[PDB]
Design an enzyme around this catalytic site. Structure first.
Site, short mmCIF file in Angstrom:
data_model
loop_
_atom_site.label_atom_id
_atom_site.label_comp_id
_atom_site.label_asym_id
_atom_site.label_seq_id
_atom_site.Cartn_x
_atom_site.Cartn_y
_atom_site.Cartn_z
N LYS A 152 -2.54 -1.59 61.37
CA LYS A 152 -3.33 -0.47 60.85
C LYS A 152 -3.78 -0.79 59.44
N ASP A 188 3.87 15.25 56.06
CA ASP A 188 2.71 15.11 56.95
C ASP A 188 2.90 14.07 58.05
OD1 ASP A 188 -0.33 16.39 55.55
OD2 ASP A 188 1.69 16.83 54.78
C1 LIG Z 1 1.39 2.61 61.80
C2 LIG Z 1 0.62 3.74 62.52
C3 LIG Z 1 1.49 4.73 63.34
C4 LIG Z 1 2.86 4.42 63.20
O1 LIG Z 1 3.44 4.66 62.12
N1 LIG Z 1 3.53 3.77 64.19
C5 LIG Z 1 4.97 3.45 63.96
C6 LIG Z 1 2.97 3.58 65.41
C7 LIG Z 1 3.63 2.91 66.44
N2 LIG Z 1 3.03 2.79 67.70
C8 LIG Z 1 1.83 3.33 67.94
N3 LIG Z 1 1.30 3.18 69.18
C9 LIG Z 1 0.21 3.86 69.60
C10 LIG Z 1 -0.14 5.14 69.14
C11 LIG Z 1 -1.30 5.75 69.64
C12 LIG Z 1 -2.09 5.12 70.62
C13 LIG Z 1 -3.25 5.71 71.14
O2 LIG Z 1 -3.69 6.77 70.68
N4 LIG Z 1 -3.87 4.99 72.11
C14 LIG Z 1 -5.11 5.35 72.84
C15 LIG Z 1 -5.11 4.55 74.17
C16 LIG Z 1 -6.44 4.69 74.92
N5 LIG Z 1 -7.60 4.28 74.10
C17 LIG Z 1 -7.78 2.81 74.04
C18 LIG Z 1 -7.71 5.00 72.80
C19 LIG Z 1 -6.38 5.07 71.97
C20 LIG Z 1 -1.71 3.85 71.07
C21 LIG Z 1 -0.57 3.23 70.57
O3 LIG Z 1 -0.17 1.97 70.99
C22 LIG Z 1 -0.43 1.60 72.35
N6 LIG Z 1 1.20 3.98 66.96
C23 LIG Z 1 1.72 4.14 65.73
N7 LIG Z 1 1.02 4.80 64.78
C24 LIG Z 1 -0.21 5.55 65.23
C25 LIG Z 1 -1.41 4.63 65.43
C26 LIG Z 1 -2.19 4.72 64.14
C27 LIG Z 1 -1.96 6.14 63.60
C28 LIG Z 1 -0.69 6.64 64.27
#
Ligand SMILES: CC[C@@H]1C(=O)N(C)c2cnc(Nc3ccc(C(=O)NC4CCN(C)CC4)cc3OC)nc2N1C1CCCC1
Ligand SMILES: CC[C@@H]1C(=O)N(C)c2cnc(Nc3ccc(C(=O)NC4CCN(C)CC4)cc3OC)nc2N1C1CCCC1
Lengths: 299, 299
Positions: A106, A234
């Site tokens: 990210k 948040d």
């Molecule tokens: C460091 C950012 C934060 C965080 O702290 N961790 C630990 C985190 C760990 N794992 C995830 N995993 C996923 C979380 C959301 C999605 C998701 O929304 N996927 C959709 C699937 C279909 N399409 C392609 C559109 C999107 C997928 C994830 O992995 C497969 N996200 C994390 N986030 C989030 C990600 C950015 C902001 C919040």
């Protein structure tokens, strides 16, 4: 290839190769939290096909993140391969996921980087105390990339979701007073992002046994108190459900956030839950309680 | 560890790893002769034990030297290992030799680097025409190293001597009018460096058959004309003898400069002969003839 990505893969590769030679002690010194390694590269009339000609790469506190990786059960070579063997895939706040779905990448602001530096020591100590067993984000690396003009910062974390098992529903829970509903543009994507009131409205239940529920809430309590004590808020609880009768045994050593449903569950479900979005700094104090109230209820 | 060496090993390692990813075509473009890759590294409170904290590394015309290496029958991985697996050994104009005795690493002036750039294209074309079969130095790489304050330039060449078979006598022949005798301080080292008149005085003969002698002198003629046509001079013929009945079959594919003695030789000898010291710019014209006169006689 998008240049900033190539630089990241290049950079992670370089960084892990350097560390492979370093003698790794059990302890970090206070200087390890102020450390970094910069590399600036200039190619004149050379290697145009893969890399950009002029780029910088900066790794923050390489020793701390080396130590964290191992504490989270991640080997440096596997981490390397996951980020390098093939390009990370986009989703465009945008994010990338490693080709093997193990890691999230990210983009963050310089302000977030400043806050990470600010909390890294305390964060590290927390991970030591809980023996790496936590619902907090698992921070695995932090970098600065420059490609002729553009400077970006990225952080790498472990994926909350599975690297095999798909997820058909996703929630994002804060437990706030301010009405939290999802919008309709989201609903039309392969996997929307439902929010508080979607949960406390579509009658969503989590069928986990009373033991699994006890452990989780205990962890959640400690983690959130830690977050509150750093004046952080948040953050959300990311919740993701995998229906077995659609696409269901998982590896708890890879998909570390998974919890199986209990035997009396209406459908064969696997839940993935953890805290996300911690780096923003009404107050932090009650936000934690307010967060804990909500999750205690819904689970 | 001496820092400038660590940077060289580090740098050669990095450079060869980069090239392994590049698609290598059969042809070089004119831009390949003007090309380079710079890397500047800054470690703050990190990796003090191996590398210096602040260093630069510059590789000149990486594509040209990649192409030359292959033309001289050298694989990039072997070249890498020979320079990296263990440190190069000193002799302190000082030089280093790879731990496996295959390569020589010599410090040169920025003026020499300028002259190398000046002749590199013509040099490359010469190597093409003679299919890599020459008595000229085999230039394999050229670099600039910086370690906080100190900047040095190095060139890498193939060793004229063997990587196994020791050498008990060494000559350095120019065939000049100006009296060339050795000094006595040299004589007291494990292997002195004898000169023209030491040869045409200690009654030294080279027992090679009339065929081997024909091929050699033909090569020498072409090479030296090439050198003369570039206005180069002050080069020597390095001559080194290995007595088998002291320490004798060799690999002509590694020790490319070796020539076996003929059957009627008083002792079992292996000779190693090639041109060295070409990068200085009475004149160049007759120096070549004068050089060719001498060698025709003594051999
Ligand atoms: C460091 C950012 C934060 C965080 O702290 N961790 C630990 C985190 C760990 N794992 C995830 N995993 C996923 C979380 C959301 C999605 C998701 O929304 N996927 C959709 C699937 C279909 N399409 C392609 C559109 C999107 C997928 C994830 O992995 C497969 N996200 C994390 N986030 C989030 C990600 C950015 C902001 C919040
Ligand atoms: C790029 C420099 C130039 C060159 O052009 N080429 C091609 C070259 C190829 N191979 C060699 N090989 C050796 C030449 C001389 C010696 C030698 O004098 N060795 C002694 C051994 C005992 N003791 C430790 C003290 C020194 C050893 C060599 O390799 C084993 N030298 C070359 N030189 C020479 C080296 C620097 C100036 C001239």
């Amino acid at each position: 290839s998008d240049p900033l990505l190539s630089v990241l893969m290049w950079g992670v590769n370089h960084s892990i190769n350097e560390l492979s030679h370093v003698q790794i002690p059990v302890m970090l010194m206070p200087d390890d939290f102020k450390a970094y390694s910069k590399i600036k590269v200039d190619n004149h009339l050379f290697n145009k096909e893969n890399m950009p000609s002029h780029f910088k790469f900066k790794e923050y506190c390489p020793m701390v993140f080396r130590n964290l990786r191992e504490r989270f059960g991640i080997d440096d070579q596997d981490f390397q391969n996951s980020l390098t063997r093939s390009a990370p895939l986009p989703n465009d706040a945008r994010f990338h996921t490693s080709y093997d779905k193990r890691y999230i990448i990210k983009t963050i602001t310089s302000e977030d980087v400043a806050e990470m530096h600010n909390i890294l020591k305390k964060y590290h100590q927390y991970i030591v105390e809980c023996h790496g067993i936590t619902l907090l984000p698992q921070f695995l690396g932090m970098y600065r990339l420059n490609v002729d003009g553009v400077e970006i910062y990225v952080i790498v974390t472990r994926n909350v979701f599975s690297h095999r098992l798909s997820v058909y529903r996703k929630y994002d829970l804060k437990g706030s007073t301010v009405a939290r509903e999802a919008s309709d543009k989201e609903k039309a994507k392969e996997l929307p992002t439902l929010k508080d009131n979607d949960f406390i409205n579509e009658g969503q239940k989590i069928y986990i046994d009373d033991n699994n529920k006890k452990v989780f809430l205990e962890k959640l309590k400690k983690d959130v108190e830690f977050l509150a004590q750093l004046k952080l808020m948040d953050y959300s609880l990311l919740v993701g459900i995998h229906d077995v009768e659609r696409a269901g045994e998982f590896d708890p050593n890879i998909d570390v956030y998974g919890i199986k449903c209990h035997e009396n569950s209406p459908r064969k479900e696997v839940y993935f839950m953890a805290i996300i979005d911690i780096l923003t700094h009404v107050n932090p104090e009650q936000y934690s309680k307010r967060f804990l109230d909500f999750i205690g209820h819904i689970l």
